[PDB]
């Protein structure tokens, strides 16, 4: 799959994007690769953060669906007009698909100044598409219209006046064995909406957090390429930070640091990595009572940021943060690993990435199996609203 290697780029903390074309003749746009959502949406009008945008009127193959769409996130929001057009991924499979496209006509706190992307490719499932689940997602249309296998894989890699450039690979339709070492371990997709998974155990430097495992997945756990941080439920975040602070206590950081609101620095090349612990997330295995662990380094959860001031220092941001909407395994987790979104088999694979950042004493790892007798249920059941209950599903 050599032509798809190195098909992702971006700026550290601002998203990985892939080049796509939309329309006839093809307009090129940089599109955020987001496994935490299910819409293909592109800037379609002027915005102070956009260099360029989709112009429906210049496309001979555009069809208007004469329907609007609205997507608020917590942080972030956009709206636009629905239609279809021809879409291709130049550094992807050699095919062209007719897909749904949301033409973003207005937004708030969505586009990111300097990120160099103009749209989003939601790679998750129809259930969480807007306005509803009859708007077929891009990947679904790709699979139905072409012979491309129902799987994609992501290798996200490497992280004074500008942020650092990052690179990665999105392999559509298969697995490229040059992008990983060792074994590939699979965790079930719990339900096809988000890429929901189940964490059964958490350790910080070998030490079990010893919480009821349902807390790890309160109110869900998901794999999301479009989120920078590892985000943890409030209770878990608190326990995690208490344990990391204890490991690192030779260094008394400001509160702002642990809130992700302040950098901490050392003289170039002198960062004391070994005072920061590894974090191990045990994921449910394909077999009853089995699990496997993925282990990340401080090199993953301390994000490097270059101080225009003291550019003579190596400075870092803490990239683990509190959530009220469940665990998010964001780019912090994914930069450790080659991650296989095996939709055909309702599972997510992890292996050690051939490009992850480490040192001479520790590595990110994927290891198993681990076995538990009479393993309880670690999944949470989100309270059912009357609104959601009333939906029909024909
Ligand atoms: C629940 O939707 C998700 O998790 C998606 C969408 C996402 C990150 N991943 C988000 O939340 N805001 C936002 C803003 C810009 C780009 C991507 C996103
Ligand atoms: Zn009905």
Q: For tokens 């870092």, what's the residue?
A: 316
- The residue contributing the CA closest to ligand 1 atom 15 is 110
Q: Is the CB of 109 under 6 A from ligand 1?
A: no
Q: 124 CA to middle of ligand 1, Å?
A: 12
Return left, alpha or beta for 327; rule: phi > 0 is left, psi -120 to 50 is alpha, else beta: beta
Angle at 282 between CA 277 and CA 283, to 5 degrees: 145
**Tokens found for residue 132:** 């509803």
Q: State the Cα–Cα distance between residues 266 and 313, nearest whole angstrom.
A: 6
Q: State the Cα–Cα distance between residues 90 and 111, nearest whole angstrom.
A: 23
Choose among 192, 220, 203, 247: nearest CA to 327: 220
Q: State the Cα–Cα distance between residues 135 and 100, nearest whole angstrom.
A: 7
Q: Is the CB of 349 under 6 A from ligand 1?
A: no
Q: How many CB atoms lie within 10 A of CB 24?
A: 14
**Tokens found for residue 380:** 């949470």
Q: SS3 of 241, please?
A: helix
Q: 129 CA to middle of ligand 1, Å?
A: 13
Taking the CA of residue 225 as reference, the ligand 1 atom at the shortest distance is 9
The yes/no answer on whether domain 16-148 falls in CATH 2.40.70.10 is yes
In angstroms, this model's resolution equals 1.8
Q: For tokens 């990947």, what's the residue?
A: 139
Give the sign of the dihedral formed by CA 141, CA 147, CA 151, CA 155.
negative
**Tokens found for residue 316:** 């870092």
Q: Residue 66: exposed, middle, or buried by beta-carbon count in 10 A (0-12, 13-18, 19+)?
A: exposed
Which letter does DSSP use for residue 130 in this model?
A: S
Choose among 246, 234, 245, 232: nearest CA to 202: 232
Q: State the Cα–Cα distance between residues 225 and 230, nearest whole angstrom.
A: 11
Q: Are 301 and 320 in contact (CB under 8 A)?
A: yes
Taking the CA of residue 222 as reference, the ligand 1 atom at the shortest distance is 4
Q: What is the largest CA-CA distance in the chain?
A: 64
- Residues in CB range of 114: below 8 A, 6 or more apart: 11, 14, 49, 162, 163
Catalytic machinery residues: 34, 224
Q: 68 CA to middle of ligand 2, Å?
A: 22
Q: Which stretches does DSSP call E strand in 54-191?
A: 63-72, 77-88, 96-108, 119-122, 152-156, 165-172, 180-188
Which letter does DSSP use for residue 277 in this model?
A: P
Q: Is the CB of 36 under 6 A from ligand 1?
A: yes
What is the separation, in whole angstroms, between the first and last Cα of the chain? 38
- Every domain of the chain with CATH number 2.40.70.10 lies at 16-148, 149-394
Way it was determined = X-ray
Q: State the Cα–Cα distance between residues 359 and 336, nearest whole angstrom.
A: 13
Q: Are 39 and 126 in contact (CB under 8 A)?
A: no
**Superfamily of segment(s) 149-394:** Acid Proteases (2.40.70.10)
Q: State the Cα–Cα distance between residues 383 and 385, nearest whole angstrom.
A: 6
Q: Residue 45: exposed, middle, or buried by beta-carbon count in 10 A (0-12, 13-18, 19+)?
A: middle
Return left, alpha or beta for 300; rule: phi > 0 is left, psi -120 to 50 is alpha, else beta: alpha
Note the ligand closest to the C-alpha atom of 392: 2
- The residue contributing the CA closest to ligand 1 atom 5 is 36
Choose among 366, 358, 360: nearest CA to 157: 358
**Tokens found for residue 126:** 């129809």
Q: Is the CB of 110 under 6 A from ligand 1?
A: yes
Q: SS3 of 368, please?
A: strand
- The residue contributing the CA closest to ligand 1 atom 10 is 73
């Amino acid at each position: 799959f050599v032509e798809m290697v190195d098909n992702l780029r971006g700026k550290s903390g601002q998203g990985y994007y892939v080049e796509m074309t939309v329309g006839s003749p093809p307009q090129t746009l940089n599109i955020l690769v987001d496994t935490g959502s299910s819409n293909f949406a592109v800037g379609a009008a002027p915005h102070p953060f956009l260099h360029r945008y989709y112009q429906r009127q210049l496309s001979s193959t555009y069809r208007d669906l004469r329907k609007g769409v609205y997507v608020p996130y917590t942080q972030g929001k956009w709206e636009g007009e629905l239609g279809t057009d021809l879409v291709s991924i130049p550094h992807g499979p050699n095919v062209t698909v007719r897909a749904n496209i949301a033409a973003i006509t207005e937004s708030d706190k969505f586009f990111i100044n300097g990120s160099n992307w103009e749209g989003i490719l939601g790679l998750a499932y129809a259930e969480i598409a807007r306005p509803d689940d009859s708007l077929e997602p891009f990947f679904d249309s790709l699979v139905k219209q072409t012979h491309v296998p129902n799987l994609f894989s992501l290798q996200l890699c490497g992280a004074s006046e500008v942020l650092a450039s990052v690179g990665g690979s999105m392999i559509i339709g298969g697995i490229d064995h040059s992008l990983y070492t060792g074994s590939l371990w699979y965790t079930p997709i719990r339900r096809e909406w988000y890429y929901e998974v189940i964490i059964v155990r958490v350790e910080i430097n070998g030490q079990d957090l010893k919480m009821d495992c349902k807390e790890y997945n309160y109110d869900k756990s998901i794999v999301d390429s479009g989120t920078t941080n590892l985000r943890l439920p409030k209770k878990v975040f608190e326990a995690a930070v208490k344990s990391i602070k204890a490991a690192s206590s030779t260094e008394k950081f400001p509160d702002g640091f642990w809130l992700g609101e302040q950098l901490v620095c050392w003289q170039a090349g002198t960062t004391p990595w070994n005072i920061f612990p590894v974090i191990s997330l045990y994921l449910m295995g394909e077999v009853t009572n089995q699990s496997f662990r993925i282990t990340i380094l401080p090199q993953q959860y301390l994000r490097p940021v270059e101080d225009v001031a003291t550019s003579q220092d190596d400075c870092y941001k803490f990239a683990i943060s509190q959530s009220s909407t469940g665990t998010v395994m964001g780019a912090v987790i994914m930069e450790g690993f080659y991650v296989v979104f095996d939709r055909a088999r309702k599972r997510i694979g992890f292996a050690v990435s051939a490009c992850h950042v480490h040192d001479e004493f520790r590595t990110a790892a994927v290891e198993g199996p681990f076995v538990t007798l009479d393993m309880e249920d670690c999944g949470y059941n989100i309270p059912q609203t009357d609104e959601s209950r009333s939906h029909h599903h024909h």
